Design a protein around this ligand. Structure first.
Ligand SMILES: [Mg+2]
Ligand code: NA
Ligand code: NA
Ligand code: NA
Ligand code: NA
Length: 320
DNA sequence: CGGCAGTACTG
DNA sequence: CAGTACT
DNA sequence: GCCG
């Protein structure tokens, strides 16, 4: 990053807009920061700034203030509530609306939340694991967790395929959580497996809390055995084999990469989801789908790129 | 002006 | 539904 | 916030 002295100041504003609910402005900032982090050389001119996609007049102005003064005056006027809103929205299951409500109600600390807030079932688990969920784990521990799930799944049906996606599959040295995708090549035997799989992972104490228990998605909490272990977030998705490539693509990410790819598909009259890549998609004036279109066959990730007119990118090149 | 990705789950 | 979450 |  050639522009740390700029992006460090910009990230502060972005986070402030985010926790305060100004999601589109925060999005704009996030995109400007990534763009700034990817420039080859320090940005030294307004006109150079404007030349970067993702940097407009308002943002170039801010970059200019930083270079000339080493500071951004807007930082001095960030609401005093922001550190508390961030504290609160780092509880899993609480977002900006809940954080703002707790703030309005007078809460200022996690002790206030613990003792006086009404928490959802998910938020109570999030609070119990507040520190742990803010920590990343070594890649090697994500391997142990993925293997734990795979061993439990394969015990039921040895044909089940399980793959850790997310940051793990993108090759990162640490992972915020573990994202396990499960399918079955025969196209049928993925069905109805959660009850038995989840029950199995509970039996020996690996699965400690459940956050979401859907027909296709599980989100919860696990902890490996022995001393020195922290609770870790674990997501499991079970998909039919026909959707494997799009599910793999979605669940490998990154999130920004997915949004970029999906926006591209939209420009070409297509739609990309975790279920499928579709063509001849009918939309309205607001970009909203009014007609479904046709599912395109995508046996592999490479086919999704191909049909979008893109060169294939290995997971490591998707870490946007 | 107005989209900014597309979807699953909860209560 | 609004809110939160996933990548 | 940026961009079509
Ligand atoms: Mg993840
Ligand atoms: Na630009
Ligand atoms: Na949260
Ligand atoms: Na109090
Ligand atoms: Na996850």
């Amino acid at each position: 990053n050639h522009n740390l002295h700029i992006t460090e100041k910009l990230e502060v504003l972005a986070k402030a807009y985010s926790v305060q609910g100004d999601k589109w402005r925060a999005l704009g900032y996030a995109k400007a920061i990534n763009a700034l982090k990817s420039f080859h050389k320090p940005v030294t001119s307004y006109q150079e700034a404007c030349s970067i996609p993702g940097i407009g007049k308002r943002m170039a102005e801010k970059i200019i203030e930083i270079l000339e003064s080493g500071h951004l005056r807007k930082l001095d006027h960030i609401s005093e509530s922001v550190p508390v809103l961030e504290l609160f929205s780092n509880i899993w299951g609480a977002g900006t609306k809940t954080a703002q409500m707790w703030y309005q109600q007078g809460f200022r600390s996690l002790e206030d939340i613990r003792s006086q807030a009404s928490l959802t079932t998910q938020q109570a688990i999030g609070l119990k694991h507040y520190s742990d969920f803010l920590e990343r784990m070594p890649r090697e521990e994500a391997t142990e967790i993925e293997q734990t799930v795979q061993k439990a799944a394969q015990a039921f049906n040895s044909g089940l395929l399980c793959v850790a996606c997310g940051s793990y599959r993108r090759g990162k040295a640490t992972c915020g959580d573990v994202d396990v995708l499960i399918t079955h090549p025969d196209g049928r035997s993925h069905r109805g497996i959660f009850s038995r799989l989840l029950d199995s992972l509970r039996q020996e104490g690996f699965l400690t809390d459940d956050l979401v228990k859907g027909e296709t998605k599980y989100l919860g909490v696990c902890r490996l055995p022995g001393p020195g272990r922290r609770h870790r977030r674990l997501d499991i998705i079970v998909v039919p084999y026909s959707e494997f490539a799009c599910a793999l693509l979605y669940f490998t990410g990154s999130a920004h990469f997915n949004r970029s790819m999906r926006a591209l598909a939209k420009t070409k009259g297509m739609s990309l989801s975790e279920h499928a890549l579709s063509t001849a998609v009918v939309r309205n004036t607001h970009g909203a789908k009014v007609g479904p279109g046709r599912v395109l066959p995508t046996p592999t990730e490479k086919d999704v790129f191909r049909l979008l007119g893109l060169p294939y990118r290995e997971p490591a090149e998707r870490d946007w």
